């Protein structure tokens, strides 16, 4: 009860997928073939969880910041949680937009406890398929005041030092492993159980080392 996130809302929440395939010449990054199959697969396996999935394609850095800012300004009162999936190139601490790079923490900053009150005390999930190279109070009352970075979870396809692999004709191993486990155990297992299995699935595929960065305060079941 008090150790699980309250999932008794009218809807599970919004899931925003940013699918970056084609990049400007000045970025020096090539076409990400196979990411369309990832986005479509992610669309299906997340709709099944109960998420209202929205897919954007080839977004510039300003575009990525704007749509996430707009989404954080929506009314999530009757929503249980929020999810965001990023499919693009990436270096350390940054994700690639169509025209360049933008700090990942700049994208997630919009959903902090002090900036997004309707998602306060609610799970905020970020799934990131990419390489990784190598402030006010939430409340005036100290009794309800929580850290602004609380209830955040990050699921990276890899760790800094290793590559994030993607099959041009099939898609990334991380997405395939993620959707597969969500289809089978997305309604019965806790989020860390699901992601731990994801880490194993990609590991036994053999380098690529997926990881989870969790600031969650409760256990997360998709009920």
């Amino acid at each position: 009860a008090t150790y699980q996130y309250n999932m008794n809302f009218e809807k599970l929440g919004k899931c925003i997928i940013i699918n970056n395939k084609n990049f400007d010449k000045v970025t020096g990054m090539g076409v990400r073939n196979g990411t369309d199959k990832d986005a479509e697969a992610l669309f299906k396996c997340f709709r099944s969880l109960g998420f209202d999935v929205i897919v954007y394609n080839d977004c510039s850095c300003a575009k990525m910041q704007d749509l996430l800012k707009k989404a954080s300004e929506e009314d999530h009162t009757n929503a249980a949680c929020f999810a965001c999936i990023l499919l693009s190139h990436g270096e350390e601490n940054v994700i690639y937009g169509k025209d360049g790079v933008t700090p990942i923490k700049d994208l997630t900053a919009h959903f902090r406890g002090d900036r997004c009150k309707t998602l306060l005390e609610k799970p905020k999930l970020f799934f990131i398929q990419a390489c990784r190279g190598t402030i006010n109070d939430t409340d005036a009352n100290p009794r309800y005041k929580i850290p602004v970075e609380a209830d955040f979870l990050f699921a990276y396809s890899t760790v800094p030092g290793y590559y994030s692999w993607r099959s041009p004709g099939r898609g990334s191993w991380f997405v395939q492993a993620l959707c597969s486990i969500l289809e089978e155990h997305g309604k019965d297992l806790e989020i860390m159980q699901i992601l731990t299995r994801v880490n194993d699935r990609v590991a036994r595929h053999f380098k690529q080392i997926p990881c989870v960065v969790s600031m969650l305060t409760k256990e997360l079941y998709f009920s």
Binding site: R32, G90, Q129, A130, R166
Partner: peptide, 4 residues
């Protein structure tokens, strides 16, 4: 296979 390609990398990101």
């Amino acid at each position: 296979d390609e990398v990101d």
